[PDB]
mmCIF file of C-alpha atoms and ligand atoms in Angstrom:
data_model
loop_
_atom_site.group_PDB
_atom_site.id
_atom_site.type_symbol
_atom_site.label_atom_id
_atom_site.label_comp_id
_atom_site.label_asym_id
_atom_site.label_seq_id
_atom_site.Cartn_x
_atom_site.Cartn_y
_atom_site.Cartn_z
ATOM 1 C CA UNK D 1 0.000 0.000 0.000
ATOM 2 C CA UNK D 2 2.988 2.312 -0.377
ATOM 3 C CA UNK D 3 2.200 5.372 -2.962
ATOM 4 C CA UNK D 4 5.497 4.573 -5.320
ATOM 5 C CA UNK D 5 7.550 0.949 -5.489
ATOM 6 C CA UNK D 6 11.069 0.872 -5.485
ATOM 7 C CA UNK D 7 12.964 1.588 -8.563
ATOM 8 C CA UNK D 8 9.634 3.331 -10.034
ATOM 9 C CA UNK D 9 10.863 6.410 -11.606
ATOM 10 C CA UNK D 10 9.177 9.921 -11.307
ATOM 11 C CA UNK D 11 9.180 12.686 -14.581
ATOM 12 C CA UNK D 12 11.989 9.876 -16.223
ATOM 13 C CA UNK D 13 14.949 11.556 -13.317
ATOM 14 C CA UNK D 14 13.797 10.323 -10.018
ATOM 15 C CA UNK D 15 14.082 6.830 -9.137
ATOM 16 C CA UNK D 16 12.929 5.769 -5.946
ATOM 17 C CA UNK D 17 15.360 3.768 -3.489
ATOM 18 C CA UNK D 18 13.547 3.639 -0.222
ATOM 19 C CA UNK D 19 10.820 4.849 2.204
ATOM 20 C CA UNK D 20 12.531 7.115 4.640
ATOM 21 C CA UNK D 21 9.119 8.396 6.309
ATOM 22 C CA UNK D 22 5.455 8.256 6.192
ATOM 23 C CA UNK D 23 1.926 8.663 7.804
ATOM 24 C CA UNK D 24 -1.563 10.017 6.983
ATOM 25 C CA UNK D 25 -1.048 12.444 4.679
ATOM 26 C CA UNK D 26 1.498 11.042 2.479
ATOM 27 C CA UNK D 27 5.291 9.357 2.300
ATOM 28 C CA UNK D 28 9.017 10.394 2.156
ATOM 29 C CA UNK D 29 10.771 8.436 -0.514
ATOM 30 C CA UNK D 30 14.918 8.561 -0.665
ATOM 31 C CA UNK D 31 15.671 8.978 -4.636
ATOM 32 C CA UNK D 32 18.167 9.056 -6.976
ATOM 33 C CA UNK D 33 18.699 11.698 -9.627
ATOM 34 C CA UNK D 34 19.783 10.450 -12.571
ATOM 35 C CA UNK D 35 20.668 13.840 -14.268
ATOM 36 C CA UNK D 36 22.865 15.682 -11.297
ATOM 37 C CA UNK D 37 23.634 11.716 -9.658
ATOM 38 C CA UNK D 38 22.838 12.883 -6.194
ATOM 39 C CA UNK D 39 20.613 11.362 -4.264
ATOM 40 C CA UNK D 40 17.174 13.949 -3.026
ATOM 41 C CA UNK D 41 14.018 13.839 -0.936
ATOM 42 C CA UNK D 42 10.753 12.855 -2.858
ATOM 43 C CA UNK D 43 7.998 13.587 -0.569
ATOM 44 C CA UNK D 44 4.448 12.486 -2.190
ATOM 45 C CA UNK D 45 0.328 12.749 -1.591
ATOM 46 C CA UNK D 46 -1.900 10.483 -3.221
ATOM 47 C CA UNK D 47 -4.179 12.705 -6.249
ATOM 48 C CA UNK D 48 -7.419 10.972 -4.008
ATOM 49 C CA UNK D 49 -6.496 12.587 -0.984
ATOM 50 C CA UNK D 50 -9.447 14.340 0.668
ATOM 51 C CA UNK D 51 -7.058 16.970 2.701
ATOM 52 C CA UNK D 52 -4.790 18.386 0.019
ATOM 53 C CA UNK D 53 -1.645 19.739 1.913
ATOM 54 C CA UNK D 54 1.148 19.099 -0.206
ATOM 55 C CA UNK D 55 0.478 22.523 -2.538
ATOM 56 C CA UNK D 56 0.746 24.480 0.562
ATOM 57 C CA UNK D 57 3.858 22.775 1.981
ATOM 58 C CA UNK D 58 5.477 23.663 -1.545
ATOM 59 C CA UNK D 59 4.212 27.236 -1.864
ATOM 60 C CA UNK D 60 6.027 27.609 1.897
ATOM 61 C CA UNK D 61 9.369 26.419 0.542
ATOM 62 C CA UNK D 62 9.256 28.205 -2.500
ATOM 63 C CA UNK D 63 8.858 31.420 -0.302
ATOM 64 C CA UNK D 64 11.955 30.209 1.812
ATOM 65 C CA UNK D 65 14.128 29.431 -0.928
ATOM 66 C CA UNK D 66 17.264 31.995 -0.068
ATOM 67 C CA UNK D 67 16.912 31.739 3.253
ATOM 68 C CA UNK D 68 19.743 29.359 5.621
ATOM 69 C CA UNK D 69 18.163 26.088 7.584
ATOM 70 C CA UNK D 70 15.933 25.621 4.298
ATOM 71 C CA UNK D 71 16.128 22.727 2.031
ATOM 72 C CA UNK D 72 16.444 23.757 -1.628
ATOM 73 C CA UNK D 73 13.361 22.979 -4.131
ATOM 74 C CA UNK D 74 14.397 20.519 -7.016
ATOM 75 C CA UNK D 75 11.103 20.389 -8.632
ATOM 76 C CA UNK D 76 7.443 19.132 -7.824
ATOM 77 C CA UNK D 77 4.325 17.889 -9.805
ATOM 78 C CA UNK D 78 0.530 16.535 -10.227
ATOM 79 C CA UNK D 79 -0.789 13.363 -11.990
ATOM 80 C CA UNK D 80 -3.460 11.336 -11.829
ATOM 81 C CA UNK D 81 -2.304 9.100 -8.987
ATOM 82 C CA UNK D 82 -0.096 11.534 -7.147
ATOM 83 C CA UNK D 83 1.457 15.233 -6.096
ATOM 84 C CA UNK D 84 5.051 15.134 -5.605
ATOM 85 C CA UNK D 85 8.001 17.827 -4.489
ATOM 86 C CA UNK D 86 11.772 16.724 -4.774
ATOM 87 C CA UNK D 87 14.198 18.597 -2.527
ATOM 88 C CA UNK D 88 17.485 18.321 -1.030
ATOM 89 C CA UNK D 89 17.969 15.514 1.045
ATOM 90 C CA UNK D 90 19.074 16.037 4.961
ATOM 91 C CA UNK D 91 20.913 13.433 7.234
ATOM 92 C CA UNK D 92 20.187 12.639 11.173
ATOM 93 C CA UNK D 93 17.397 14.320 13.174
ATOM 94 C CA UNK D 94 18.203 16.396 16.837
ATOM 95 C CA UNK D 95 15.492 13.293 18.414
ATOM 96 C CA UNK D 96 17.526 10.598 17.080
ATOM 97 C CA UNK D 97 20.820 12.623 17.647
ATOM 98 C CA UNK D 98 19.878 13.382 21.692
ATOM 99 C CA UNK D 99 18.995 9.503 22.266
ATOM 100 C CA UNK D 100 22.011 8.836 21.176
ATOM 101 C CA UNK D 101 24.139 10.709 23.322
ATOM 102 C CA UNK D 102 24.927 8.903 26.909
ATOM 103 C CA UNK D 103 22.528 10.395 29.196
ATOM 104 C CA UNK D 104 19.973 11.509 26.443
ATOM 105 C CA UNK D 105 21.196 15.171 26.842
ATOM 106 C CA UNK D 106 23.196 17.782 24.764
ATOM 107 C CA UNK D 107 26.118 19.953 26.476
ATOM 108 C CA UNK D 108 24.901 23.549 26.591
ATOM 109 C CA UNK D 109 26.986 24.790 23.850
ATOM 110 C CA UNK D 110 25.356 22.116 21.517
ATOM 111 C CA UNK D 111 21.924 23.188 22.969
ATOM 112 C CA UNK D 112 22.625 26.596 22.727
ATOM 113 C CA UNK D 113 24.306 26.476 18.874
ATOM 114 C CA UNK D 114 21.178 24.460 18.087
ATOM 115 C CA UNK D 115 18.655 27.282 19.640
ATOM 116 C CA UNK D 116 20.156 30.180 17.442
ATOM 117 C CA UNK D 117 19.566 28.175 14.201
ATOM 118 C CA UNK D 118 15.971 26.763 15.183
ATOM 119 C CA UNK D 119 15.006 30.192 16.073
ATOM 120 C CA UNK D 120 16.634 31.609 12.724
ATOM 121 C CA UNK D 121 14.483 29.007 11.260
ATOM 122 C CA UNK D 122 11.365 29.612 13.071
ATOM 123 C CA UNK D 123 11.633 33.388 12.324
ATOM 124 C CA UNK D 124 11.927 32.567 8.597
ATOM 125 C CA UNK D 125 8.714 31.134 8.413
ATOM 126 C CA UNK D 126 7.016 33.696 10.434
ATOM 127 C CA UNK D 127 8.519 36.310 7.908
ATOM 128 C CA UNK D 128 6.668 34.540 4.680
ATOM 129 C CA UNK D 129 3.148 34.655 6.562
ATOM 130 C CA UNK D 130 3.254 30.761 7.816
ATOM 131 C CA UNK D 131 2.942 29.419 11.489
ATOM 132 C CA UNK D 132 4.924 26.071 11.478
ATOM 133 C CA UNK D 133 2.774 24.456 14.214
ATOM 134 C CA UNK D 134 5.035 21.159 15.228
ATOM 135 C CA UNK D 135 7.968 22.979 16.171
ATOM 136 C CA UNK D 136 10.000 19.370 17.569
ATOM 137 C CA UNK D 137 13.256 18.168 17.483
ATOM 138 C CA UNK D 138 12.347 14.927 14.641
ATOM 139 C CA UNK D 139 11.195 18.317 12.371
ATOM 140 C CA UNK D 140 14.735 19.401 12.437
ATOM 141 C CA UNK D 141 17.869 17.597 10.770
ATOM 142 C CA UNK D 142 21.491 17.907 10.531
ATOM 143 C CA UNK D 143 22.761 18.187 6.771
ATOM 144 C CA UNK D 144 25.153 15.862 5.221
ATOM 145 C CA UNK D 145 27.625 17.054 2.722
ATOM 146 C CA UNK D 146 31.109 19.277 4.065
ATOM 147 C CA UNK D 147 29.001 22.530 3.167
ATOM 148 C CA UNK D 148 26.580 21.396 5.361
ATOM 149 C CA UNK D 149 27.146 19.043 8.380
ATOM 150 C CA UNK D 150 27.153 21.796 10.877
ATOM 151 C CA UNK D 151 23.723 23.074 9.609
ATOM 152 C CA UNK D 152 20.335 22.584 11.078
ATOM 153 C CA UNK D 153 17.076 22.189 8.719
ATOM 154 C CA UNK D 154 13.294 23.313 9.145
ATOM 155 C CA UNK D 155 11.582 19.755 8.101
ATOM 156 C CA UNK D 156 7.585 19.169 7.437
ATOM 157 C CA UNK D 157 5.078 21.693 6.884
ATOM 158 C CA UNK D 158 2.412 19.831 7.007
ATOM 159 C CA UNK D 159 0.797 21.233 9.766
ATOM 160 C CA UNK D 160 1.767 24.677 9.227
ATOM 161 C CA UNK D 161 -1.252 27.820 8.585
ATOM 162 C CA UNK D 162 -1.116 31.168 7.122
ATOM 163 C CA UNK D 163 -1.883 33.603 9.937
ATOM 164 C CA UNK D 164 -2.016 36.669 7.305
ATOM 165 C CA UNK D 165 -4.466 37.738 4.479
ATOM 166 C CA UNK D 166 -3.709 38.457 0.789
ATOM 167 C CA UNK D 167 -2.731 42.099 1.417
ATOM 168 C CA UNK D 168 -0.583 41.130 4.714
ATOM 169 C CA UNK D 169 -2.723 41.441 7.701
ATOM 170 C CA UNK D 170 -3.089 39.013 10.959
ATOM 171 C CA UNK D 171 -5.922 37.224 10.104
ATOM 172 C CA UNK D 172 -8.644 36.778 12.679
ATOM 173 C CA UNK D 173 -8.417 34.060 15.247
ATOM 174 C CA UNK D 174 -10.575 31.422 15.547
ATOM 175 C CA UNK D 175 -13.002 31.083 18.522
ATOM 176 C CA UNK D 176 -11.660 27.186 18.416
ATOM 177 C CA UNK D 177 -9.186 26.101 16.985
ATOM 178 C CA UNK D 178 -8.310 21.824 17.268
ATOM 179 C CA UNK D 179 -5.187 21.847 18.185
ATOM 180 C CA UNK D 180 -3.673 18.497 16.040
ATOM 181 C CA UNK D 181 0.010 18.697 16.675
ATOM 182 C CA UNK D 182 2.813 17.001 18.898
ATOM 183 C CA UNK D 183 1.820 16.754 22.740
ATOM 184 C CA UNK D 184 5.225 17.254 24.619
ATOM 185 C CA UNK D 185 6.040 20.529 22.989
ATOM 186 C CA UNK D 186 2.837 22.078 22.648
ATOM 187 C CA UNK D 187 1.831 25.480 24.227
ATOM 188 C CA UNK D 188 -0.729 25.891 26.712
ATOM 189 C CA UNK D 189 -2.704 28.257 24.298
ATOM 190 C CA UNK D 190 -2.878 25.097 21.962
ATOM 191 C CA UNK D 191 -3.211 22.585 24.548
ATOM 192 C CA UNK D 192 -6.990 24.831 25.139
ATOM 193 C CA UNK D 193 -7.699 24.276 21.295
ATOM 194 C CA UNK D 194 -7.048 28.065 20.775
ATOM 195 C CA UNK D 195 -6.218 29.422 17.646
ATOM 196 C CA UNK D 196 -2.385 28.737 17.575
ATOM 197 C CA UNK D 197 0.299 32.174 17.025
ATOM 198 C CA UNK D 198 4.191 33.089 16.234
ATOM 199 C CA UNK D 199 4.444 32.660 19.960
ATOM 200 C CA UNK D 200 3.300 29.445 20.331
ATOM 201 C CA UNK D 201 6.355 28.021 18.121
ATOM 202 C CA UNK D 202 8.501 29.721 20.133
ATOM 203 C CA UNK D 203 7.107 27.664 23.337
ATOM 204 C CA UNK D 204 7.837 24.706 21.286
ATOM 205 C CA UNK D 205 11.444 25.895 20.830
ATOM 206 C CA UNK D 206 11.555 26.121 24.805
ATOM 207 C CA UNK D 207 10.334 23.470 25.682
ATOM 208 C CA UNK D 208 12.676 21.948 23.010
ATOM 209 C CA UNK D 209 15.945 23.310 25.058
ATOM 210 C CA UNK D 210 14.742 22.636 28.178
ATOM 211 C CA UNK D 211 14.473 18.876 27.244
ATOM 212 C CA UNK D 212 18.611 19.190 25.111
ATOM 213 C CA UNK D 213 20.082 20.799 28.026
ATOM 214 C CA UNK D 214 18.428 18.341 31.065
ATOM 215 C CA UNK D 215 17.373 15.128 29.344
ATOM 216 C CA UNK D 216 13.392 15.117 30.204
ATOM 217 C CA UNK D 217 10.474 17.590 30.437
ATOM 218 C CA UNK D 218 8.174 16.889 33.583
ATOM 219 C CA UNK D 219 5.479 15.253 31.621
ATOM 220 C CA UNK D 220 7.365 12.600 29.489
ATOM 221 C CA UNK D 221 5.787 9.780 30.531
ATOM 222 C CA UNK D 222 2.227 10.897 30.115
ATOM 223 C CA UNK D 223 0.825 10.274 26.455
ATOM 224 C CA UNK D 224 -2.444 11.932 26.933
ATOM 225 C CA UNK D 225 -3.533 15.181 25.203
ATOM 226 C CA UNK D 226 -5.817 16.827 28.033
ATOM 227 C CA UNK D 227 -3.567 15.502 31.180
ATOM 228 C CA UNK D 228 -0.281 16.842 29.825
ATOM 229 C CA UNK D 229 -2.104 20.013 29.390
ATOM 230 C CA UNK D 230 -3.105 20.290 33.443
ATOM 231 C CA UNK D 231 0.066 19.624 34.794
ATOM 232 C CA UNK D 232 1.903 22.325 31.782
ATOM 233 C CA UNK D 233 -1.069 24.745 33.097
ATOM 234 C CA UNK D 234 -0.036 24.873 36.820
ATOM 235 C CA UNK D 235 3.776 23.779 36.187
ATOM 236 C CA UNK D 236 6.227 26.704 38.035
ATOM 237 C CA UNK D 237 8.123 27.343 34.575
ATOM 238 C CA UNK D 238 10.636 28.976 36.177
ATOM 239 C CA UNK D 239 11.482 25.431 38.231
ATOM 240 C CA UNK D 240 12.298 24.183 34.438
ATOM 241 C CA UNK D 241 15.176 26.844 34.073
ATOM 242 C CA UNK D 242 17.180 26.036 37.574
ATOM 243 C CA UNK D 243 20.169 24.089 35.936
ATOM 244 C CA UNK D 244 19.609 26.373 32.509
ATOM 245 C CA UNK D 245 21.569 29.736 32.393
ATOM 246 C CA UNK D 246 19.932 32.823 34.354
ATOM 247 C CA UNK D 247 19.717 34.433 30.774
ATOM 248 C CA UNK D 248 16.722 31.734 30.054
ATOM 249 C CA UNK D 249 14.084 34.003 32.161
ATOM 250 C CA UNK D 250 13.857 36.726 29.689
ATOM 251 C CA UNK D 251 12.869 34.139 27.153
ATOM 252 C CA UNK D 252 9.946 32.745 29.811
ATOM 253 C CA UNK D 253 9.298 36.323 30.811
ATOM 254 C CA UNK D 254 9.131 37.164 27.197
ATOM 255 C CA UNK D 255 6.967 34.398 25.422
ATOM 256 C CA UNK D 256 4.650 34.342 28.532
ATOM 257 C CA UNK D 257 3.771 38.008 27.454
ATOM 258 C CA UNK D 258 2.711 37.555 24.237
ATOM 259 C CA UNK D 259 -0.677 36.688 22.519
ATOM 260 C CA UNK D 260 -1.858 35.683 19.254
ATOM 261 C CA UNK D 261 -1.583 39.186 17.726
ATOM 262 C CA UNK D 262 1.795 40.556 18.998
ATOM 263 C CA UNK D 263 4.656 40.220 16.626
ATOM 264 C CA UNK D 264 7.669 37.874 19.409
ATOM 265 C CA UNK D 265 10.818 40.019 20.241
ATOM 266 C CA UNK D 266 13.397 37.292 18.027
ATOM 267 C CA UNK D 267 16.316 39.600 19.190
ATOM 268 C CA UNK D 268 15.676 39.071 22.665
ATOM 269 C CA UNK D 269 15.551 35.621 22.193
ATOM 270 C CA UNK D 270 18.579 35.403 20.078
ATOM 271 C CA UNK D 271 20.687 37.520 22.822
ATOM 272 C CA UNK D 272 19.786 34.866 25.449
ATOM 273 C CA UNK D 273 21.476 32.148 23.612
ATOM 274 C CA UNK D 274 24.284 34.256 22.434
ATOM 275 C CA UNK D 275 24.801 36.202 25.779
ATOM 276 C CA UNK D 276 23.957 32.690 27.427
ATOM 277 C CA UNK D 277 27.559 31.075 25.188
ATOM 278 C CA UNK D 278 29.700 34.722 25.998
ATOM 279 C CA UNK D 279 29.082 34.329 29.266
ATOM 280 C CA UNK D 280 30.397 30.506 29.098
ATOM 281 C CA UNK D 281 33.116 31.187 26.168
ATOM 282 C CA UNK D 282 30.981 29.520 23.884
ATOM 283 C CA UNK D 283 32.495 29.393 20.569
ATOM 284 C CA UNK D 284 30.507 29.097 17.073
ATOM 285 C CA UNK D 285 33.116 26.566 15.528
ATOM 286 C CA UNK D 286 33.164 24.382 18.599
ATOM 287 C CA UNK D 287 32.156 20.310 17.657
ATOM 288 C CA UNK D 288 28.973 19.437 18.245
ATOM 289 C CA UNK D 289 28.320 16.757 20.896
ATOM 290 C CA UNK D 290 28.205 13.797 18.366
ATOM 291 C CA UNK D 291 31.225 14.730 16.022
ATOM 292 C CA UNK D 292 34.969 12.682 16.910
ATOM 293 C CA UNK D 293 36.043 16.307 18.295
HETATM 294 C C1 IQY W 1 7.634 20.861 0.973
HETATM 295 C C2 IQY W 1 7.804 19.651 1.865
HETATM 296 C C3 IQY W 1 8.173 19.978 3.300
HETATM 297 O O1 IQY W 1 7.006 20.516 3.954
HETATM 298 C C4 IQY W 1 8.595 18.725 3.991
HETATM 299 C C5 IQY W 1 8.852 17.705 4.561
HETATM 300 C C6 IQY W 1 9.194 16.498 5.270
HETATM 301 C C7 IQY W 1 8.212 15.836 6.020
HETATM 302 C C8 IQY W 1 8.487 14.621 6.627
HETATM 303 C C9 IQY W 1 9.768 14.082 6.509
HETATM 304 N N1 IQY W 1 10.281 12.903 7.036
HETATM 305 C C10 IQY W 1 11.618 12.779 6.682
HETATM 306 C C11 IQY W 1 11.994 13.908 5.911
HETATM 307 C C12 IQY W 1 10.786 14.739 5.793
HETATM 308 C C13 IQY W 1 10.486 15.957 5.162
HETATM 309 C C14 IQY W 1 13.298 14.324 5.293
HETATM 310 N N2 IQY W 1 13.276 15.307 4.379
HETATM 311 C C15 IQY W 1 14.458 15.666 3.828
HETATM 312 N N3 IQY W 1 14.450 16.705 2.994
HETATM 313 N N4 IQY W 1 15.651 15.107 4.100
HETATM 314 C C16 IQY W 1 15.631 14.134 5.010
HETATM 315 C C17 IQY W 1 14.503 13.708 5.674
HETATM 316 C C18 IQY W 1 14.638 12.700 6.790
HETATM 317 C C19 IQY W 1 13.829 11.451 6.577
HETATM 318 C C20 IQY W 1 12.403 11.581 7.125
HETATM 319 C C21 IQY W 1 9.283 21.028 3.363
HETATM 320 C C22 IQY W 1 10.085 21.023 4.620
#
């Protein structure tokens, strides 16, 4: 039941090699190009599809093309049986890459490296009119050539909503809005099934470091939707941050200010993690945790 066999070629230059991921709303195939001989990323939605996503998710990347932490745009197309976009292909993911590490934790100057380019990222997409939505360590992914291995990719916007109209606005919230995204990182304004805003990703990146720098968030072990919700509701944030750097409470202080309409402070934010590595002599060129050095 998978969408393209092995070996089946797409617009005679891809030619599928693998599944790399999949779910609802379509698959992730590995490919070779046989004009350029790399390999790419051939994500694909079935033409029968009642919820027709993959459009969107190409107009986004088109918008980012330019911009660092974005996966270049090969091509994409629409037949009878499928919709397909081919882009560059990224290596390891920053889940797979904590688990890996001893005590399921990144030093602080991997955490904090990894912070400035998520929230470079996560301001990108803001800045083309899009709210990403499943801000989460699996949606971001180390690259893999020696132009790239020390650069960290925005991955999957599936989930992701324009919060602007034609002519640039905010568009109205709605009332209720079902939150359908990732439980452990999710804000507290989405956990209520509120319409979701730019500073609701940036809890997600939070929550995110919180989890690199310590190894757990309080609720890990607790799979369900409404329960995580009640104990992130009445959770002392503040007790999260007491073996992060001091600089970490203007981020709380900040995000916990803002509401759906207010354009975040991304300066502030990126002074925390860059103050945060000053303070420790943090250096950009250091190794991260899982290269030899
Ligand atoms: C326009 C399509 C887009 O919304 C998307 C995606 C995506 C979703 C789910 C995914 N799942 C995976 C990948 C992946 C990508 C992936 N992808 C790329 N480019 N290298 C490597 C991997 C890792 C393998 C798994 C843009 C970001």
């Amino acid at each position: 039941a998978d969408i393209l066999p092995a070996n089946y070629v797409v617009k005679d230059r891809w030619k599928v090699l693998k599944k790399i991921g999949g779910g609802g709303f379509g698959e992730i195939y590995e490919a070779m190009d046989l004009l350029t001989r790399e390999n790419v990323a051939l994500k694909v939605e079935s033409a029968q599809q009642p919820k027709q996503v993959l459009k969107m998710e190409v107009a986004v990347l088109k918008k980012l093309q330019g911009k660092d932490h974005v996966c270049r745009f090969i091509g994409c197309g629409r037949n009878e049986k499928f919709n397909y976009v081919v882009m560059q292909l990224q290596g390891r993911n920053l889940a797979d890459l904590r688990r890996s590490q001893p005590r399921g934790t990144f030093t602080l100057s991997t955490t904090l490296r990894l912070g400035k380019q998520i929230l470079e990222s996560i301001e990108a997409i803001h800045s083309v009119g899009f709210l990403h939505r499943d801000i989460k360590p699996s949606n971001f992914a180390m690259g893999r050539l020696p132009s790239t291995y020390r650069k960290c990719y925005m991955l999957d916007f599936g989930l992701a909503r324009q919060y602007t109209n034609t002519t640039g606005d905010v568009r109205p919230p709605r009332n209720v809005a079902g939150f359908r995204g990732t439980v452990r990182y999710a804000s507290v304004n989405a956990h209520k099934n509120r319409e979701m805003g730019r500073h609701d990703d940036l809890w997600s990146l939070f929550y995110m470091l919180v989890e690199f720098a310590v190894g757990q968030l309080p609720w890990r072990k607790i799979k369900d939707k409404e329960q995580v919700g009640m104990i992130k509701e009445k959770y002392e944030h503040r007790m999260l941050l007491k073996h992060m750097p001091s600089e970490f409470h203007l981020f709380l202080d900040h995000i916990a200010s803002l509401d759906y309409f207010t354009k975040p402070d991304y300066q502030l934010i990126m002074s925390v993690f860059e103050n945060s590595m000053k303070e420790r002599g943090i250096a950009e060129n250091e190794a991260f945790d899982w290269e030899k050095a």
